[PDB]
Amino acid sequence: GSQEGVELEKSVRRLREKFHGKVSSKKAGALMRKFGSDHTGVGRSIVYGVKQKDGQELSNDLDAQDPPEDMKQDRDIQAVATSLLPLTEANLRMFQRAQDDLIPAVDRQFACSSCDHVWWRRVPQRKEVSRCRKCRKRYEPVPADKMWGLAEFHCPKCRHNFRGWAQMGSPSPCYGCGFPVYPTRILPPRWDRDPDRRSTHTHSCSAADCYNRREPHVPGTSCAHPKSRKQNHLPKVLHPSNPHISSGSTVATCLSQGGLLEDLDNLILEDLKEEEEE
Ligand SMILES: [Zn+2]
Ligand SMILES: [Zn+2]
Ligand SMILES: [Zn+2]
């Protein structure tokens, strides 16, 4: 796959997302060809306009930055800055983040019921949405208190610590003392972390359900691991994402995914391929 395509699309997406999608793709594309994918500097240049064209005390809460004169004088940048007025108390933190080259972000879990597809994605804090890669529909996150995966347990009674595949809000029995322990959190699968965070990792459980049950087992418990789920003919998805209803300002995934298993350049490349066909 040609990287210069992935990187062009990445930088149009990043310019847009720093303006919460209020800059168009056709316009971002032009800006990114003409200025060599420099979303940071285009972005900084737009905010300079807004600060300049705004007459409120609010615009002193924006930094005054040096815009390349070929950007300061560009009429398409300037028209964008106008198109984004006015500057409001509800607008102002968007514009600050844009000039700080900042897209605040969060790792979230996602679950497409009809694909029975679960995945993780680093998404923007302003719009925690990711697209199912099997069926191409956008979904909202699984709620924090319903997430499942490799979980960390800290028994409050005896201080045994253990790791295991599990869902939030569902106690497991402490292997130490038998009292019920709720998971503290879920750890996403990551190539730079312990492989026990992967579903591919060998798993053994005290649940009666378990595809690979530990002994002694606990008689009325059910295992969250997808192999167990499948073996018991249950859907791998324990708790589906609500489908996301598009409001219009969404920007497709342009965030670096860190050590999550699905990296960004491949996500974008598959996106560009899908478009070639259509
Ligand atoms: Zn799907
Ligand atoms: Zn215990
Ligand atoms: Zn199990």
Bulk shape: elongated
Element pattern in H and E: HHHHHHEEEEEEEEEEEHH
Helicity range of the residues?
Answer: 25-40%
Biggest β-sheet: strands ordered side by side in the sheet:
6-5-9
The DSSP helix count reads 8
> Structural class of the helices, strands and pairings?
alpha+beta
Give a short account of the largest sheet.
3 strands, antiparallel
Q: Using only CA atoms, what is the Rg?
A: 23 Å
As for the number of domains, it is 3
Cα separation of the termini? 18 Å
Cofactors and ligands present?
zinc ion
Total number of beta strands: 11
The fraction of residues in strands falls at: 15-25%
Give a written overview of the molecule:
The chain has 3 domains: 3-102, no CATH class; 104-141 and 243-278, no CATH class; 145-231, no CATH class. It contains 8 helices and 11 strands. It has helices spanning 3-17, 25-34, 39-53, 69-72, 75-83, 92-99, 226-231, 264-277; strands spanning 105-112, 117-124, 130-131, 138-139, 148-154, 161-167, 172-173, 180-181, 185-187, 205-207, 213-218. A 3-stranded antiparallel sheet has the order 6-5-9, with no helix packed on it. A two-stranded antiparallel sheet has the order 1-2. It has a two-stranded antiparallel ribbon with strand order 3-4. The longest helix is centred in the first third of the chain and has 15 residues, at 3-17. Bound molecules: zinc ion (3 copies). One zinc ion binds next to loops. It is classed as antiviral protein. The entry lists the keywords Host factor, Antivirus, -1 PRF, RNA-bingding, antiviral protein. It forms a monomeric assembly. Crystal structure of human Shiftless (SFL) containing phosphorylation sites Ser249, Thr250, Thr253 and Ser256.
